[PDB]
Amino acid sequence: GRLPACVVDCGTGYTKLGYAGNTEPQFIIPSCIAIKESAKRVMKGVDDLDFFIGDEAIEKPTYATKWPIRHGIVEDWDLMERFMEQVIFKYLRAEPEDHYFLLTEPPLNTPENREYTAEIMFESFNVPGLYIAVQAVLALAASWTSRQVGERTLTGTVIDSGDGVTHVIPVAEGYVIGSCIKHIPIAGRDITYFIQQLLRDREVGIPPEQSLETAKAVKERYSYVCPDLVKEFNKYDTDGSKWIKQYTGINAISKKEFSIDVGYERFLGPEIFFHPEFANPDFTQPISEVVDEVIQNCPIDVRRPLYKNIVLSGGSTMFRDFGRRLQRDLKRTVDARLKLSEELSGGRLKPKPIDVQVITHHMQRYAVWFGGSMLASTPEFYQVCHTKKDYEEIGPSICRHNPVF
Amino acid sequence: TATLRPYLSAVRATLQAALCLENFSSQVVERHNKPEVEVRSSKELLLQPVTISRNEKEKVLIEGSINSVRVSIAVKQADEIEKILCHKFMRFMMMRAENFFILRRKPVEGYDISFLITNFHTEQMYKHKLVDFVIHFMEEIDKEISEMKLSVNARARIVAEEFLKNF
Amino acid sequence: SGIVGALMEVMQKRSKAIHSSDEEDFEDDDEWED
Amino acid sequence: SGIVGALMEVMQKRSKAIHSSDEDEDDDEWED
Amino acid sequence: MDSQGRKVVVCDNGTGFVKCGYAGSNFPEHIFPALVGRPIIRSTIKDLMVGDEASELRSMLEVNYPMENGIVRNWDDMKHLWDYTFGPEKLNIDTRNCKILLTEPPMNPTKNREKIVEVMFETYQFSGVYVAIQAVLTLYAQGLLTGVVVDSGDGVTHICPVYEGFSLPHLTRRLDIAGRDITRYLIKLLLLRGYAFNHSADFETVRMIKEKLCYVGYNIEQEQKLALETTVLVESYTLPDGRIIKVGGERFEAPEALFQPHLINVEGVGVAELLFNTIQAADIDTRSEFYKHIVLSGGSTMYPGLPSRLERELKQLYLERVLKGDVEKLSKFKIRIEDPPRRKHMVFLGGAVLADIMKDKDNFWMTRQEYQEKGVRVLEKLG
Amino acid sequence: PAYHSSLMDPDTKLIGNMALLPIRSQFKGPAPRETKDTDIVDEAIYYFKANVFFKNYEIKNEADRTLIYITLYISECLKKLQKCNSKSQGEKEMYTLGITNFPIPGEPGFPLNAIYAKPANKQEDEVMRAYLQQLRQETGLRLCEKVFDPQNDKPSKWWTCFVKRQFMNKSLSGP
Amino acid sequence: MILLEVNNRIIEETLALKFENAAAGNKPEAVEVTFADFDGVLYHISNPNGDKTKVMVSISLKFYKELQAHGADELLKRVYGSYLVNPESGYNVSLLYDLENLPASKDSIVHQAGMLKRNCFASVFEKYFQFQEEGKEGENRAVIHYRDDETMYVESKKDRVTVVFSTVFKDDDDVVIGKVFMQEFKEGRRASHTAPQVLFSHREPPLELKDTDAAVGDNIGYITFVLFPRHTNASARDNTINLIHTFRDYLHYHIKCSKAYIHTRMRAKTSDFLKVLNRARPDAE
Amino acid sequence: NKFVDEGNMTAALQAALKNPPINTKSQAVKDRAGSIVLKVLISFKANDIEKAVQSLDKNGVDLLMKYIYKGFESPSDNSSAVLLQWHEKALAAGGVGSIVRVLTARKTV
Amino acid sequence: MSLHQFLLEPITCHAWNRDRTQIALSPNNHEVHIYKKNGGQWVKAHELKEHNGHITGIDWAPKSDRIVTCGADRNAYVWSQKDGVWKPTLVILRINRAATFVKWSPLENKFAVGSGARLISVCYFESENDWWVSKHIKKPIRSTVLSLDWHPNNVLLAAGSCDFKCRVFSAYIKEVDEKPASTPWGSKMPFGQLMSEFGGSGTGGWVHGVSFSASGSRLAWVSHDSTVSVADASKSVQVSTLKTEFLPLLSVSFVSENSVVAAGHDCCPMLFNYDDRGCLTFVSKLDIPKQSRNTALETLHQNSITQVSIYEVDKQDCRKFCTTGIDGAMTIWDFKTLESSIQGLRIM
């Protein structure tokens, strides 16, 4: 009888669309819009309705591709409104006057962007309810599938990473400590330019307009994380038959085929997460030191639960041995600090050895959407939404603060 | 401009006399600085309110004080579509009132838009450019509303034409 | 209580369903410990 | 000296100078 | 400067700020913060950094307050702060031939005073030390010998009645709200606007914002009516790194926690009701003299519009709870709140007046010799 | 971080601020003869493919200066060995490159002059030039045997993909 | 996108992905999705009894009894044929697809499965068009409650077929904008000559619609389509059905697009006013 | 202590600007005086307004500007265009200080 | 004629020293900046910072070389130079509202502060414990006092305020002053006695500026009524008013016995003549432009002028005068060049 709510998650690279109650999103489309060319103003007639989004936007003649979301924040609002028009009325095919909505926001967001989003949703589409959710609590709620009943709390550190910057967000009792949020400029795009530079330097025969897609396919299909670099180089040099792979591709113009050798970039791809000076000659700090600094900038009483509940999220954390490498580096950094404090104290400080644990679960790729869907499937979701009557009576100041609890 | 030019000349000449402000501290609460046209605690610092009307519907009310001027403008609304377009336009500006610095978040009753100019704005901007901005605002509102009405009518004609064509 | 207790209720309902759905070249383990 | 002494008329002079509002607390010399 | 050539130094050690100077002057010679900082960078310039420069690069260090409401917590940090105070950077005095006047908050333990006198006599070896009560010095600066002092500084807000030059100890009251609680509440209120500040690394920026923009509303029904219709309360502030923030309706909301403590989860009543109960707890024949002389003090009473609100609340409480039926009887009764603009440093001016009067009397000060063949019993000359 | 040497011996002849580590070579020079199977040339060839991506090195002892000098000369040898076509012409062109008067520390032209220390008298300069020439010739002769695929007798693509990479953004020759 | 589409998407990508993975040779996977459409229509794609080699698509309509009274079951039996099965509990029409016994060209069956909602709204139109073509007159009208407060009336005269809508505008601006839009629909026979005739009546029911429970209040408008035998012949009629049952969503979609374009123009004018007002500062630009 | 204060149409205009209320507190006298002054003003011709304007002193121009700014508060038919033309011709020989003396007046008329 | 753009912020007030080689000004904040002319360029020499509020008044004494400042924080200081640095000294004012104006006495032994709590404070010096004490004039002032000026016999004091009146008070203090002689203003002069009270019946604006003449027998004031008025006390305290056709004027000064120079919101100084028969007449503007969207107004000042001061000698012999404005500029005008440039302009 009751219609399910609509869950929309917007990102820099991909947007995830679907209905509440499901375990997977119904659509994962690129976050680009193909507008008509300017060719030179007042748009006479229905000229603002001549556009395409998603996979149809990429490589269309006599159209210009625009990316409205830049590092998590919306730059152009007209393109965002025209994006959400074809999200609602073409893909989801939902009448907006009957469905509640749930949208996500970047973790460092102004209230003005919340007021603009509430303006668009309440005055252009007439939705009966709206809820703008933070991503870290949804990712931490989606992490409960792997763990059992007893270790189900809302304290932990969330590492979000893909197509943008990597955020390290600590959260305690459902409330995000916003004073200690740090970011790392290495993300999923920079691995693709690193792999593209390596394949440009080594291999030959790649068409120049298809280097980016082949680099993305090599990253998604063959990359992993090595424990050590020089032993992996020795393994590739000695037994070259087992580890060196072959990739085939189809040319777009001549419709022929090409084959290349995939080599050292299988482990040199994600290694810029832990050695960022390989590609970016401005940032030298590895991710484990940033996580340790974020936890050490928190208050004293919360630091021991934050070490025990590190939760990975995002699409760029889907490499094979990520949690084990991060756990080993964090244990080495913490044990270095404790041995330094023990030798400086001279027998005065004898702390307990802490427990570091990094959690990998099944739904790590779409954790924020899964947490939003299982939040919106509850019967108590409709009592914390901002209705249209409160927007009409009180005003647009009700969406500045949210009822998390 | 059958009657627009003497109406705008009279509004400009009244606004030139009203915008003569200076700094003034409060004399009922110590070390406070508030605009006197909104507080209205002392009668001797308030000037007489004046109004300028073009017809029975369009009017401008000007209220002055020692350090603050309040200007309320009523906009011509002929049709029913122009009424809701003007109401959406005035509601659109007042939400972004923090970037304007001279706009009120809620109008005086009976009027459409309301400006509040204190003495801190005349120390930070030229006075004659503020007067020219108010006259430019009142001139550009009606042109924007007429262009909106013509665009809505043309889009409705083409949307009806496509659906009746495709049968 | 609130949305949080119903959230643990719906995750405890879905957890055994997702755990029932999932029912060799990198099997080396000794390089990972210190 | 001690507690009561020169301190008393020092406090009298300071109360005369600082608290002068008390000599208006309430709400032939110029013959030419 | 006495007849024998020994300099007289008045030092006021606060929880937040040390104010030091000479006797007889109308201005403090130096005002600096009171914190000792250690580098946390070696845990992740100089091993021991003390003073206002240690308040400059606070985010690079970890800081410690050696003084907490007149109680010494860390003795080594307090010795380093006193070494910085009597040094060539600030005062440049030779402590072998000087006399010093120090202050003391009400309801102090005797052991802390004994330890402070022992450190001043044994380490720095002054020629004369005197310790005085802060409320008596606050009444000495204004010109009064009988009144009620309401002082709110950086520690605990105190209300103390002083009668005939002696503070009554069984009638003083305290309230646990001061400037650090207002700064933490301003951080909590500014978090909802979107500006995120650290509770330890960004304390000084929010302290300067609170000193610049915050005030006390007179009518608390008129201020948010002005904040709902106009944009005249929004002010732009420039951060040191370069960002520009906007502060709106939170300017009159944080110091309202002084009058309503339940906003910051502190039980009890406000400052006006506590002042009314403190005056009404005394005997009948001396109530009107306490009502005619109420002196404000401390740096946390520097908000604009505070004594008008305090006088209005006290007059409303005395109307409703004593007379109870007549507005005509309220006009004959005199209630005065004394609010001079130099009220931030009343303790220093009172100490300077008391040191300038008694700079030649040998029975006032206690000497190094009277400590040397009596020990702790030289504190018996104090009272 | 980056990989460091481990052949430090408490009684080592410190030439300048470098280390006079022994090598196994038939070329004439002032280095002592090495009895073990591991010397600094094989360690530098082992660590070259991992160290060349790094840009921030940190000096711990005196063997690291010899390590970074041999790493830069492996980069120069790969630049000169990209264009070759047979093994014996590679031996001849390494024999040409080994006797080239490369700039020593102290002279203008050596890039890491601030880290290194120039010698003082003439005999230290002479034995430093002889030691650097012997190290250059030995690492060229050992780098010939690894870059060439024996079945094809052309330079391999797995070693000639590091031509356009520099260690600490430095080069031993001109641009 | 000016005109709306009649095919559902999620059914077409889900069935195309399952059919390509079945025809490739791989083992099938489990699927469980519930979703919605226009006018409160629910969809459920699942596996019957946990069997992963079979998929099953079920629809849920609130008003299936009124469509069943006009004979919607025979049309679904004629179109789908052997794929029609017994319905799931809580659902009205269910189709079963087996991934082992599949035809070769897997293009027509996905397109027929995507139009399940359109095939549910096609019995009453074909029945009344057949009544117009046969020449019988005097039959009762059809009352379809396609929403909670909206009603469709279908009547067949001797020479024309009349379709009366009854839409409700919630917002007060939508009444004025829809009055402008239907004023443009009413005079649209000037440009296009061979067209169905559109009539509009605000706040009142038409005179032919009488002795019913027709609405009176100020937010209700009545839209009348008059269709001729050149539109209701055999080899056009499905196209006519493809333009009739999606009219209301088309109208409300274009009203919401006009309300977005007005917001775009207000953003441009507010940026121009701020750029004018910024220039007045002395040497601070 | 609140602040408490203490054919011959030209001859018809000169008589209407003569003998006004000066200190009376009856509102009916002010209303009938404003009525007869506005009745003289709106029934005037259009070409000879400036001939009536430049036959007055400074106090007559100030009183005319006060009556013109009083006449805008109750608009009826096409009287507002006549009042705007009168305001333009009075501003051409009276300056901005006439408007300043209109605004800073403790006794309305 | 000689602009110098000191700031981009408004200048609230300004003061000159005796030899006109240094200037003190407040750049719209809680600080006082002292600029020094070396050669032909202006270099900022000193900065004074003790207030925690908006500074409203600066005055520099010519002989004793002390600077008095008052601000909106209910506080006032007096600054004296020693060893190359300026040190402040306390003033006990006993006011509970903000202070608006400050003027030194002609003999530099008192100073007058006009404040917002409906009273005037006259302050003198006490050297037994080194401060400045004050006495209060309250009745019959009913609003905020906006301007002050001292008579040249160190007794009388003119004051204009927001209750639309201009009053003359007696500020005689027995401790520091000597016994004065009779004036045409009055004969009985105790402290706080009201000499005369000039205003208007019904109409009236806020009095923005007052001034005495050179002989001290004439007074002039400007209103917000766009009126300028001159009162003569020798001819049985008669008054003459003139209604201008301009925006109101915020400052006025006698440059002679028969001429006044005023400035205000018109960005332009103006000259008025007062003959012996009592007829105030407007003569000319002193900023006639040269005969020859960016606005580019045809005045030397781009915003409102708030202060007119005499630059050359005194009121006995005036040849130059200086103006400061909200636009942040300082302009020096010359009477000799204005006579040759503008025909028909004689200064009497």
Ligand SMILES: Nc1ncnc2c1ncn2[C@@H]1O[C@H](COP(=O)(O)OP(=O)(O)OP(=O)(O)O)[C@@H](O)[C@H]1O
């Ligand atoms: N195994 C993998 N599977 C899928 N994507 C992967 C994988 N490894 C890396 N990626 C990368 O993940 C990226 C997509 O990440 P994600 O969907 O989390 O981004 P986003 O839309 O920016 O996220 P967010 O919702 O957190 O803002 C792609 O750029 C892709 O290259």
Ligand SMILES: Nc1ncnc2c1ncn2[C@@H]1O[C@H](COP(=O)(O)OP(=O)(O)OP(=O)(O)O)[C@@H](O)[C@H]1O
């Ligand atoms: N103008 C101001 N307005 C508001 N608060 C202020 C102002 N100036 C200083 N403060 C605050 O007042 C406090 C300083 O008060 P003060 O110097 O009197 O304290 P203290 O002597 O150290 O305290 P205590 O005597 O209780 O130990 C700080 O919290 C500071 O932020």
Ligand SMILES: [Mg+2]
């Ligand atoms: Mg992202």
Ligand SMILES: [Mg+2]
């Ligand atoms: Mg204190």
